Symmetry: C3
Subunit: 289 residues, 3 copies
């Protein structure tokens, strides 16, 4: 049968980005809905689980997206709640590319570290957005001592508490109100991620290149001024003295491949659940070829 992807977007209209990548992942047809909520998604899921039987079920799948991760998660939980017994299809959550971006970034850094970050300090500057929170979660699952930073302690602690509950980890929070406190926060860190909003610098070249402990720096911001000073957005494990850098476009190349590969996996079984953990497991395989 034809591979049908149902795209459920929490925004007013479905993401164009998610359509292109869905087709490049091998969907035969993508049918998109905007304004999806936990209340209206149940009837859409019924359409996917009562129309095809046996092996044909794996040819229908669900992708949840949109700009807001918390809204995407509520819809994704309502999808999983509507399934029962054998009445289910594979599903994926990737609101604004946040899961695939964080999975790509953490997989590349863990590989560059020699395959382990256990017991080492990892700092996620501006870690209160969805990319920073998913990065913190994946690093903490790998055993890193994670400090999730932001301009206000209350917001940073609420982000750490949310990650800790969802992923069963113990990330800690720190307030970094200014440039100087972000330079102080990376002292003694082995791994540094900048997960800031687009077009902002969070850490100059002098604040990381003179810190002996820093092994690898990773930046998710591709718009100049880049999150980390002294690197290029295309860096992908480029050496700077004894340290290695990953720029946003170096990470982005793997994120695009991973997102397409997750879509293809949705049609290989009718019971896949692709959220951060499963997406990250695939990212690590794809970083080792």
């Amino acid at each position: 049968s034809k591979k049908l992807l149902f795209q459920f977007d929490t925004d007013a209209t479905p993401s164009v980005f998610d359509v292109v990548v869905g087709y490049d992942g091998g969907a035969d047809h993508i049918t998109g809905y905007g304004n999806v909520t936990p209340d209206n998604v149940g009837a859409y899921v019924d359409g996917t689980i009562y129309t095809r039987g046996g092996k044909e079920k794996q040819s229908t799948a669900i992708f949840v997206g949109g700009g807001d991760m918390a809204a995407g998660e509520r819809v994704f939980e309502a999808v999983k709640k509507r399934f029962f017994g054998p009445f289910r299809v594979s599903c994926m959550l990737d609101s604004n590319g946040s899961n695939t971006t964080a999975a790509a970034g953490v997989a590349l850094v863990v590989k560059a570290a020699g395959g382990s970050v256990k017991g080492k300090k990892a700092v996620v500057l501006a870690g209160t957005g969805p990319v920073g929170m998913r990065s913190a979660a994946l690093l903490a699952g790998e055993g890193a001592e994670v400090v999730l930073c932001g301009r206000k302690l209350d917001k940073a602690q609420a982000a750490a508490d949310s990650v800790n509950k969802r992923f069963k980890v113990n990330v800690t929070a720190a307030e970094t109100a200014d440039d100087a406190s972000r330079a102080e926060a990376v002292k003694g860190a082995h791994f540094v991620f900048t997960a800031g909003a687009i077009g902002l610098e969070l850490l100059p070249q002098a604040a990381w290149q003179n810190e002996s402990s820093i092994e690898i720096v990773a930046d998710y911001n591709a718009q100049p001024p880049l999150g980390i000073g002294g690197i290029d957005a295309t860096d992908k494990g480029k050496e700077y003295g004894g340290k290695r850098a990953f720029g946003a476009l170096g990470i982005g190349g793997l994120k695009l491949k991973l997102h397409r590969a997750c879509i293809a996996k949705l049609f290989e079984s009718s019971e896949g659940v692709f959220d951060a953990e499963e997406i990250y497991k695939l990212a690590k395989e794809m970083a080792v070829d």
Copy 2:
């Protein structure tokens, strides 16, 4: 040329269920619209009748759906009104699966009866919803003497009048306010259908298995408690004494195949009109 289905849904967004079945019926592409009304549908229909010529016209078709049958019918009449002369495409109406469900149910019962129900009493309990009304219409078109039941006579009579006007049949109405009256209403019936809302029992086992006249019972409710007591939802002509039973899942298997087959017919000509009568004609071929 590619088989293009245009899906016109009266609800805020198009039915996912209708998309999957449309693709499995052989549409190459489905383009769906929500909030479709008799007023905005005309311009959509123009796009289907002025873009392709000759043999290619049959490669575009229209499917009308949504949760409200009366709203679907108004859009479907506006679609038919927009065509003129040879400027037309095939169209189907199946709001909430009501046509394909009723067509499958009645086709299976008529086949199990030996191919005729003419002159025999058929009772449709909770027959005032779209499935019950379309079932009453198809049974009456087969010559059965149909009694359409509901909790209030005014609503049951309005449903019978609507069916009678649309289909040129003579269905009668009856008030059955509770279990006792439903049990009384089936006495002397040869065929009994339960078309109740989801998850409700309407006819316990003792209300039909001891009625000598009853030949076949059919239930459209798949959610326990089932409309008919003493049967399984998967029953598909299963024998109980000298009687037969069709559960909702036994009927639903044919409805899904029937719906897919109707979609494929839309692309075989530019003049098909798939409403209850034509869907039912195909359901009978598919049961034989």
Copy 3:
């Protein structure tokens, strides 16, 4: 890579007509958005320019449509503004089919004239709609002395001013309130176009057939009464006493081929820009 067309419609929902012709033009998939504005289109364009690299970029393209040409143009300018450096895809603007209609009509009249209309008087009756304004734009670009007519001078002058600014030409306006003034307005004209609204006559047979200066007449109205009296909608350069005529269906045959060719070309490079000028350049090649 699959050829993905992103349809951005300024109306509440995307045009059905544009979907059918996009598919027949060779798009593998069409994904449509309604309510597109200069403000929300930027994020949609980002989805087209950051998802594919190298030779795959040209397999995604953009089509802008809707019933209002000015609204379409604002969306189309915002699409072009979002591109930067090599981060771009091919795009087309054809709100309500007006660019592909005007380009087909003007191309045929210019070819039939021997390849030039420079310095000759061209009159566009009811030229204030998008087809008339685009015809006046393309004719003025060909060096014709263009008079754009309408029932009220203010509306005709506003249309002329808009064309002049956008295309850098010098179209003049004239008020022709009725049949008598329209018959007076064509005196001395070598080329006449009727770009009136559907189902209206603007130029009776006696108002053009006895004027010696007139060489070719062209009508965009396909619905009787036709814009030009004494012709058939299928006429395509047909001779009427030393003069040639083009009816709306004769022009339309070129138009349907031109629109398909524009869709196919969107996937041949990532830098095509299909507005009036480029559509007209292609229409001129296809008429040969």
